[PDB]
Symmetry: D2
Subunit: 305 residues, 4 copies
Amino acid sequence: SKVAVIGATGRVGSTAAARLALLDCVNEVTLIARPKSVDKLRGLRRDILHSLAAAQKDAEITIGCERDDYVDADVIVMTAGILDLTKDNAAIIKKYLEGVAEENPEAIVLVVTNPVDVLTYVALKVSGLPKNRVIGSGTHLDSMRFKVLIAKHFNVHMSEVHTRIIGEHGDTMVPVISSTSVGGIPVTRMPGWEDFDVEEAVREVKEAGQRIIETWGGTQFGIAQAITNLVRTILQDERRVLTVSAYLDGEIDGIRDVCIGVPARLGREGVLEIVPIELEEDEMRAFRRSVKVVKEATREAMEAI
Amino acid sequence: SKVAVIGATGRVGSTAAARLALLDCVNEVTLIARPKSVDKLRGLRRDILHSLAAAQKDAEITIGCERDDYVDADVIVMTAGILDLTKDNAAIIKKYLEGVAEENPEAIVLVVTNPVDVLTYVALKVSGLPKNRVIGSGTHLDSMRFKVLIAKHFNVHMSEVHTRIIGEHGDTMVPVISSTSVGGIPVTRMPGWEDFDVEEAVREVKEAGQRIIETWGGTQFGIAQAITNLVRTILQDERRVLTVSAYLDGEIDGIRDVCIGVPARLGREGVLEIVPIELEEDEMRAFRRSVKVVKEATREAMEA
Amino acid sequence: SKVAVIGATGRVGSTAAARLALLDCVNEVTLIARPKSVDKLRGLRRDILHSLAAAQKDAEITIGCERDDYVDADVIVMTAGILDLTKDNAAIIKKYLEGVAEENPEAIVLVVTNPVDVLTYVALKVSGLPKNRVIGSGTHLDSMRFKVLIAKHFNVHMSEVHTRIIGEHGDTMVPVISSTSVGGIPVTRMPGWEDFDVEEAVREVKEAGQRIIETWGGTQFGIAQAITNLVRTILQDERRVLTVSAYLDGEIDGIRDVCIGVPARLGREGVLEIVPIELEEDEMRAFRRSVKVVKEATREAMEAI
Amino acid sequence: SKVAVIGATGRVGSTAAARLALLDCVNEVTLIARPKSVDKLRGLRRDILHSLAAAQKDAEITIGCERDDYVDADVIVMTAGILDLTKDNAAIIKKYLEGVAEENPEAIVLVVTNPVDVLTYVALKVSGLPKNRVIGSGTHLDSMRFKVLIAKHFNVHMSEVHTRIIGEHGDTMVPVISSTSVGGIPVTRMPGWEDFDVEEAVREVKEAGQRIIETWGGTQFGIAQAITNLVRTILQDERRVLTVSAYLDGEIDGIRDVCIGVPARLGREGVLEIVPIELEEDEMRAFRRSVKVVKEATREAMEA
Ligand SMILES: NC(=O)C1=CN([C@@H]2O[C@H](COP(=O)(O)OP(=O)(O)OC[C@H]3O[C@@H](n4cnc5c(N)ncnc54)[C@H](OP(=O)(O)O)[C@@H]3O)[C@@H](O)[C@H]2O)C=CC1
Ligand SMILES: NC(=O)C1=CN([C@@H]2O[C@H](COP(=O)(O)OP(=O)(O)OC[C@H]3O[C@@H](n4cnc5c(N)ncnc54)[C@H](OP(=O)(O)O)[C@@H]3O)[C@@H](O)[C@H]2O)C=CC1
Ligand SMILES: NC(=O)C1=CN([C@@H]2O[C@H](COP(=O)(O)OP(=O)(O)OC[C@H]3O[C@@H](n4cnc5c(N)ncnc54)[C@H](OP(=O)(O)O)[C@@H]3O)[C@@H](O)[C@H]2O)C=CC1
Ligand SMILES: NC(=O)C1=CN([C@@H]2O[C@H](COP(=O)(O)OP(=O)(O)OC[C@H]3O[C@@H](n4cnc5c(N)ncnc54)[C@H](OP(=O)(O)O)[C@@H]3O)[C@@H](O)[C@H]2O)C=CC1
Ligand SMILES: [Cl-]
Ligand SMILES: [Cl-]
Ligand SMILES: [Cl-]
Ligand SMILES: [Cl-]
Ligand SMILES: [Cl-]
Ligand SMILES: [Cl-]
Ligand SMILES: [K+]
Ligand SMILES: [K+]
Ligand SMILES: [K+]
Ligand SMILES: [K+]
């Protein structure tokens, strides 16, 4: 399996490529950058190879700056980026991913560049790939953090909690308490749920990104591990129900023609299906509002081309 | 951490000891059997030590036939076993576990011998240990098997399924669909649930044991891995919600004075609590029917 | 990958199949027995499936009693067995493995039935397979135990010790101190080597089998884990230098036409090569004597057919 | 176990803290930097906590800028760093690690800041800690890289190769072919050793650092994983023989009063001993030449 990382010179790309190389299901990682940044990729390549030696792991680490270098990959991770920024990043998506289905119709693309929901739609539109082979990180990490917050409240092993945050990876994210469980027990029926402040929790999840930006400079190790989790789930055909930004086609509320954070059973074929989750009234209204923000943002992004 | 396996010369005990010794959290395993069966334990000890060498793992393997060889263990796994059956096995429980708490009050006892729910109660009574430190395998394996069947039906990663079979480790076991979820979604709302035959699944779970006995002679690898799973959850203080035979004290429908399969958050201190699971009508009726059978069988065991 | 276990009803076969199913590189385990023992395989199949559920692992467990059931396997493990016993077991080898190369020339056979060195030669002769795809457990476990004994003497992590016992899996086994090292340092130069009694150690390794036989009934968990280690090394193409019973063709002392415990670099193709280890005078003499015992035993076994 | 990372705002420190927090043996990581850089640590703390959530792992992440925030750590990883360079870095060592043993005598210090061998000596002197509890990354990564090159040459599993680069973490490093083995066989007797260019391999090992700095800006992931490997060996008392910068006291050729890369059996108590490795003529000459450079550079650092 070959995983290409476009934007490997950045904080997210660099750390993603390092942790992806450690996966046993990844035999080759190709670092992609602008032609005037490949020399920096030569250093990153050596540093990662040193990490593998230390961890007693093996992977092929190649470098390049052209379409021929990453088009044949099994997974293409887009981490290259910076209203007008959504423009410029959307253009980057286009330059890299336009017409990929013609050379490799079996490619899987995972977009991380923000706005992730908008740019996954751009990636799918320009790529020509099937809707099941183009996704974005979306609210995956947000859901995993919410999962930990609940597990710590009830003081149970993390694996016992199943939860998800759907919608935009941003202010309009929606927690789905209606499909949240602790050891299979609906969380509303668990002792102590009354003492969990869902709103504070969501707030902690929603603002963390901006707080990290103004202090450490931006997310790095968090998003990198989330990418690793998604790529492993795919390449090892694990068929987990993960919350990622995917193209909706009526599976939830007949909502259609948008890419947004939703539960998806993920395997080697990409999105095997979007789980038709049934939302309560409030959850449905918040989810509809979130779709409204993403669709308008997607329209402006496409108008820009 | 030291784990003692009583009944280590048997099918279950031997295999349990072997897989327990592979755990990083288990630094010593003590093989316990009757005095006449000591030499057999010497060979099993060496065989397990060979397994550790091949797995590049380590563990101190000790052997004994006396109380002083296991009373100070952190976990005592009870696999020694022959109504006439329950009586003799309860006598074995009493012989080995009477007055343990007087010498090791922090010991944890895991009962595996059948009837496990009954003998779990016997163990707690004769042990004098706290209710939270005496449990049984119960329907733990039954729940994990049910989990795989649901997972294979929806074709999802097994970790996505959380389900549970509570009550007797036997014919009166009760599946808790009310507390069964896939990715957090109530299983009733998952697409395709109509095509899942719950009753046929339960039959496969409750009947397999008899089928294995009639063919291979009895379960072995399955129960040994379940023992390994339970002991690791305890010694590593993982705080998982597993279904084990434990003493009920009014957590579910105010039922009391019985050891039966229930959800319990397990850690290094044992049963941290029995989760107050809310059951729907039919499930409640079946569970109460199962508590009746277990309580009756327990009184006869205690009387002898 | 499919691994067939012939003799799965026995102590070694049963436990081998259970631990092999737990390997991520093994997707199917086929239990093979005599037609009048398949019903017992039905119980073992269920018990193993229960073990996987408990360990949260997956494997396909099939059963059968004919050549069509195991001939297409990727690895065929022979654990079916009981001078005259060497006869009867050799006949069993023949019944199961004669002409396998005609239906599956890429099959790999791992013999465990004793005498392991003799019966690996029988298996290779009757199978028609290439010499690199037929081996036996040999002195693999014996070497691993010797490795632990040395590591405990020097109180170092086991991974630091590299050693091997070559020759017959029996009284004529030979320790190769000349190729024994602790962290790469020749063990003869390590502080405290003078306090290690090699003879007692070898004795502990040589007699353990008989002592276990007269007490617990025979080896079970030890040999099963050794089989698992060998199958994993093969199916995952790990290219370790493991000591197994293999066909010698002049790689050591120009010794040829015998199967005996020797170091072999092992991968998906079986024996990639027998490492031409250079033995000291005493080690060479003991190794030559061991070959003499195996060759005579092999001749008598073949005369029996 | 609590591991403190001083210099956590930097490339190495941040990445080191992230991978350390993933270790099961590390329950707490304390991020330490200068008072003005505290808010930056808040963001790094949250980023690492996100990584743990995604990896389904746990760890308490603390932050500080004072001695009291790290003196009680079990392992203190020194990654804070700017001859004028060595002097300033030695001043940093002194500021952070002076008098640690007075408050935490069982602390273990791992020095990473370059020149690592020199600053390891500085750390030991100013710390007052025992010689066995102060080490440096030294040629640990250099040895692991050399191991992979030999392994790829013979096309064997990497675990089959045991090799070692001792001496200075720099130009005067010395490979110990005399103590290099493949599967226990002396590498000199392994078929194909003639086709292995040792000198070209050493050049690739000693020059890569400069190449990474001139391109990516400096090493990061490699050294962070090496730190993670060393800390795990200590906290899990694995007793591996790893090459680290440690205080020599006559174990190799009676050389004394210098911290330099040498084989050391590492456990929870630190350097359990420096293995008395026997070197052949040329290797001995190169090692003595390297001890000269390190001792000289160490005296100048101490003088300032
Ligand atoms: N949860 C989420 O969805 C997260 C989203 N992200 C997104 O990831 C992206 C990268 O973030 P980060 O790595 O911190 O940013 P960095 O500035 O560290 O790296 C940016 C990367 O983009 C490349 N790049 C920038 N402009 C162009 C261009 N015009 N053409 C080609 N390549 C270009 C850079 O290459 P060069 O060195 O040549 O400039 C570099 O590889 C951002 O868009 C960010 O929003 C980040 C974290 C989490
Ligand atoms: N709850 C569950 O899920 C499961 C329950 N079990 C129960 O485990 C028990 C053991 O099963 P199994 O291992 O197959 O049986 P075996 O006959 O194979 O082993 C029985 C063990 O009990 C010992 N034992 C027998 N009689 C006595 C006695 N009077 N006093 C002391 N020790 C005695 C035996 O030692 P010795 O050799 O000296 O006789 C041996 O160690 C049974 O009660 C069985 O029902 C088994 C599997 C699953
Ligand atoms: N280090 C080593 O090399 C080791 C070698 N071994 C060898 O493994 C072999 C099996 O040992 P173990 O499992 O303890 O023995 P068991 O008696 O427990 O099992 C024997 C197995 O062989 C089968 N078998 C016996 N006779 C025949 C026959 N005529 N035709 C077909 N199948 C037959 C049995 O089937 P059924 O039930 O129908 O009889 C059963 O599957 C022995 O030869 C032993 O020497 C064992 C351990 C270690
Ligand atoms: N031995 C080895 O194998 C390796 C050695 N190293 C060494 O590690 C050190 C750090 O490298 P790197 O992380 O890339 O460097 P960075 O500049 O990225 O980080 C330096 C770190 O040191 C801190 N620091 C700088 N000046 C001072 C000071 N005067 N007092 C206190 N803290 C200070 C910085 O904090 P702030 O942000 O507040 O300035 C920051 O945490 C260097 O000395 C380098 O040579 C690196 C890699 C490998
Ligand atoms: Cl990282
Ligand atoms: Cl998710
Ligand atoms: Cl359970
Ligand atoms: Cl087993
Ligand atoms: Cl070996
Ligand atoms: Cl090393
Ligand atoms: K890899
Ligand atoms: K252990
Ligand atoms: K498997
Ligand atoms: K941790």
